[PDB]
RNA sequence: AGAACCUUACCUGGUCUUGACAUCCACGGAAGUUUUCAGAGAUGAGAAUGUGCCUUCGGGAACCGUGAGACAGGUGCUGCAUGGCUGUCGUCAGCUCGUGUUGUGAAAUGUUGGGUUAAGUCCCGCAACGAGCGCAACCCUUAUCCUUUGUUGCCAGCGGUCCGGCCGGGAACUCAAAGGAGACUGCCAGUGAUAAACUGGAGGAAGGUGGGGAUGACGUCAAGUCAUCAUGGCCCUUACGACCAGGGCUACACACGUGCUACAAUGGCGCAUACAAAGAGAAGCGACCUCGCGAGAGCAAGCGGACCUCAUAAAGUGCGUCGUAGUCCGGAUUGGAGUCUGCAACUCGACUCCAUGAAGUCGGAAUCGCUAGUAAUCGUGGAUCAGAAUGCCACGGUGAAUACGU
């Protein structure tokens, strides 16, 4: 819409990709996250948590 | 009042004021009155014979200050008296306007 | 990016006929609200959009106050003047903060605020358009039927409502039906329906007659009054200044065709058309149609009229459930009492006897002289006390001394009656005597006087036990009032 | 908006009829194509060769022949049975309606008058107040300017020049094609009833609707067309329908209508040379070179088009020259030799060469056109068209006189 098109001005993104949805995970189990591994194929920019 | 000089061309701008002006001085003072009148207070019934006879075709009660050269037959409530001078109108109109004012209560 | 802001403002301005300024003010408020939600603390935020570039700056602001209660939104005058010496109490200090990235979240908020402003201004335009048509018959299509109202579509995004009270009792509308009704109210409410339409009120009848009778639209015939029982029966009163036109005949039309068209639009409502008269009694006779009136007695003081009818016409004059008398009373503005000729005579004889008994009792006159006063039209002690002396002197056998004595007796009888009621309750006598004791309200004085305690002496003679049953009087308050009364009566 | 045949509806004569042409049904034959022909041709007698698709192969579609018919056909009569279309009063300013109003009424009033105008065009007055068809304005073309684009259009300043805008190159210019600016009594003065408006002036490319055009109010002639076509009747249907060859529409004591060419010296002939616009073009326009005195022919660029071609404009001018004559005026008519179109030029084409040389020497009664880039005069293009203009429709060159006035 005109308001979604206005993202080009301040944010800069052309059309925010094409659609919008964040890979969310399913249910059935609780837990406590004890250990996180991040492996990076060489050449790719490491983000701040890596 | 809002336009007719900037909405369109200047040729029709000056012209449509004349359509307003010629309609104002002859009709404009009756504009906000809907329906047939109820009493015509007339200043002269002689040269305005077409005025007094137009109400009798509609049964409106007429009031007219007539002179000796006028015709009393047309008007119902005939008021005799001089009405040609300017001084007589000062006594006439100011008095009869108050009679409608006491009726507006 | 830049030119895209201008293209969006131009597209929205042209499509919604809305001021660009109002859209920007709302986008600024939307972005300020979206910014406030990204901070954990309650901050105040101003956003300013540049009208040429579409670029926007975000400012956190603090209100300059004397005492700071909210450190997240308020700053002391001393601290504000450290940044700008020109600032006063009530001004704002502004810090430029990082403008929120225009993600699909801000985009959705901006869309919602635009849609809200578009609706607010579409609504203002609808109110301004329909304000000139207040009092007129509008035609709508039924969009939705609820239990309590009907929503009409008028076109051009204008919605009207008919309330349940504004409908006829037997009407059943379906979505897609066409409905006519009078626009009787335009409300500039920020939420809800703005246009209120009626089919039940008298204005619907008046405007249907204006459309169906050209002589009413041309102001040749005037509707003076309308009384209505919606979907059952109505009465209209018509006048004309043109003696060549029958106003009733014009409203009925050829074989009733005009009145039947109006009746059909109102679901078969029966319409009586009556001639307006400037004489109230003649107008009420006309309003009572189709019942024949035998006599009318007018009570100007009570604004009531007693209507005598023949015993055969009584049921017609009252009508089904009193509908005819009620519609005539609403049309005339008078309270109308319908009775038989025999009942009216019996009522007048009972009133005359009650007036004679009152005059004999209070004026110390004989029954023969009291009868003469009633035959001359005097019914009350007030009339005899206050009427001009000339009218009393027109009565055969009254001289100026006897009229003066009669007026003095009438005034004294009125004073006696007033004093009696003022001592029976708490109007004046007990509102001064019994209420002398400090603490006596007017209600308590009337409660005391209802027990026969009318004076401050009567209260001084009471025990606490004699007053214990008076609602709102405690034994302590009773004891205090009796002692106050005794202090004034016995020790003053 | 163009009759040699065709056209063509007419005449002489040769032929044919459910047919020149259409829908429907029956059976055969594909259709098609080539050839010999009877005869003036039509039509008819034939003779070869081919015999394609769908396959419901016991039949449809495409198409020819034969037969029966119901019909088809008619430029045959009625324009006063009519539609459509069109002419004219006249691009004159007029023709009416609604409601109110006056009169018994038919009707009148409005639209009448004082002014003014191209104009019931506006203005004022008015028992009338508004509305509609017209007038005007809106549309097209031309009148100057700015902006966009720059080819096949153009050449100012810029280099090479077979010195041709031909070639680099340039974007202002002419020109081109789109959109706007602009002229509206807008400004001034006098006049005029402080009206409308008129007569001058200013600025302006243009000034009083700038010029031209389209546009044609109710109705009038019971105008014209039945032959464009459509169509009620009426009538023919071995016919007034149909097919072919040839003729006629062009014939000729005579009168009128409309033009062309002239009667000459601001004129004719010869030589040299200047200046257009617009339009047309594919079984069509035709360079160039070449044979040809000429009309044209041969080979053949380019161009289904701002480029190529028709297409090298005429008076004008400069000069020579004739010398008021029926003559270097005029050229009708007539004989001979040819050019192309087309099956065909005799009745009955245009054109060309050589020869020929008429009437006519500015026109009586009477009558017509035209008020400006008009009259007059000159040359060009186009539709029609195989071919066939002096006509009609368009274009531009040159360029007047007079309008006291009713």
Swiss-Prot record, chain A:
**UniProt PTM comment:** Acetylated on several lysine residues in the presence of glucose.
Q: In which domain of life is the source organism classified?
A: Bacteria
Applied biotechnology:
Co-administration of salinamide and rifampicin or salinamide and myxopyronin suppresses the emergence of resistance to both antibiotics.
From which residue to which does the signal peptide run?
none
* Its biological purpose: DNA-dependent RNA polymerase (RNAP) catalyzes the transcription of DNA into RNA using the four ribonucleoside triphosphates as substrates. Resistance to the antibiotics salinamide A, salinamide B, rifampicin, streptolydigin, CBR703, myxopyronin, and lipiarmycin can result from mutations in this protein.
The record describes its quaternary structure and partners as: The RNAP catalytic core consists of 2 alpha, 1 beta, 1 beta' and 1 omega subunit. When a sigma factor is associated with the core the holoenzyme is formed, which can initiate transcription. The rRNA transcription and antitermination complex (rrnTAC) consists of RNAP, NusA, NusB, NusE (rpsJ), NusG, SubB, ribosomal protein S4, DNA and precursor rRNA; S4 is more flexible than other subunits. In pull-down experiments interacts with CedA.
Task: State the similarity comment.
Answer: Belongs to the RNA polymerase beta chain family.
Q: What is this protein called?
A: DNA-directed RNA polymerase subunit beta
- The protein's organism comes out as Escherichia coli (strain K12)
The shown residues of the full protein are 896 to 945 of 1342
Swiss-Prot record, chain B:
Q: How is the subunit organization of this protein annotated in UniProt? A: Part of the 30S ribosomal subunit, contacts bS1. Some nascent polypeptide chains are able to cross-link to this protein in situ. In collided ribosomes contacts ribosome rescue factor SmrB.
The protein's superkingdom reads: Bacteria
Q: Its gene?
A: rpsB
Q: Which protein family is named in the record?
A: Belongs to the universal ribosomal protein uS2 family.
Function, as annotated, reads: Required for ribosomal protein bS1 (rpsA) to bind to the 30S subunit.
Can you name this protein?
Small ribosomal subunit protein uS2
UniProtKB/Swiss-Prot annotation, chain C:
Query: What triggers expression?
Result: In response to low temperature. Negatively autoregulated. Induced by cold shock (42 to 15 degrees Celsius) (at protein level).
One Pfam family in the UniProt entry: S1
Which UniProt keyword terms apply here?
A: Cytoplasm, Host-virus interaction, Repeat, Ribosome biogenesis, RNA-binding, Stress response, Transcription, Transcription antitermination, Transcription regulation, Transcription termination
Q: Where is the S1 motif domain?
A: 135-200
**Residues covered by the KH domain:** 230-293, 302-368
**Keyword RNA-binding carried by entry:** yes
Acidic repeat 2 (AR2), required for interaction with SuhB, interacts with RNAP subunit alpha (rpoA), NusG: annotated span: 427-492
Q: Which residues does the annotated region (2 X 51 AA approximate repeats) include?
A: 364-489
What happens biologically when this protein's gene is inactivated, per the record? Mutants are sensitive to DNA-damaging agents.
Q: Which Gene3D superfamilies match?
A: 3.30.300.20, 5' to 3' exonuclease, C-terminal subdomain, Nucleic acid-binding proteins, NusA, N-terminal domain
Return the sequence repeat spans. Answer: 364-414, 439-489
Q: How does it assemble?
A: Monomer. Binds directly to the core enzyme of the DNA-dependent RNA polymerase (RNAP). Interacts with nascent RNA. Interacts with the termination Rho factor. Interacts with the phage lambda N protein. Interacts with SuhB via the AR2 domain, crystallizes as a 2:1 SuhB:NusA heterotrimer. The rRNA transcription and antitermination complex (rrnTAC) consists of RNAP, NusA, NusB, NusE (rpsJ), NusG, SubB, ribosomal protein S4, DNA and precursor rRNA; S4 is more flexible than other subunits. NusG and the alpha-CTD of RNAP interact with the AR2 domain. (Microbial infection) Interacts (via N-terminus and AR2 domain) with Escherichia phage lambda antitermination protein Q; this interaction (AR2 domain) releases the autoinhibition of NusA.
Q: Which family does it belong to?
A: Belongs to the NusA family.
Name of the protein in question: Transcription termination/antitermination protein NusA
Which organism does this record belong to? Escherichia coli (strain K12)
